[PDB]
Ligand binder design. Sequence first.
Ligand code: U5P
Length: 147
Amino acid sequence: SNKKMINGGTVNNWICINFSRQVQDNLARTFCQELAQMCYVSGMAFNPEPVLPPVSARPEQVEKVLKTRYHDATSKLSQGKEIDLLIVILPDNNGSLYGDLKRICETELGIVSQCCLTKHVFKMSKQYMANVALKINVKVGGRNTVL
Ligand SMILES: O=c1ccn([C@@H]2O[C@H](COP(=O)(O)O)[C@@H](O)[C@H]2O)c(=O)[nH]1
């Protein structure tokens, strides 16, 4: 047995921010679509469309991009609803960007986030997608089997 979902969580509203200069908008979009579809067939409720299209940003503007995109996406939502998930595409070698992302998400925005490295975006393997679905599920309050 590989791990599976016991209870799938719910991602009704999500957005993607991209920090990789090797990744054009359409690829981030296609990536997120494949990931969304994996989470769904694995047992989640998962909106096949994001609240807003992916945006591309420089690592240097992590604070500004995250806060602004959070604000703009949340504002688009029916009053009282919140963003369930941020998918972030990172350069493979991103230095302090991961840790800065996570501090902002955890302690300022209080948003669930899932980072994905450029190398996996390019490969978009089903095994990778399945693993990341599992991580997401736990993060949004689902439950997975144990080995
Ligand atoms: O200091 C770190 C820690 C993790 N990663 C990457 O982020 C991913 C997972 O992100 P997340 O599940 O913590 O959101 C990985 O596949 C991992 O290699 C980094 O780029 N920097």
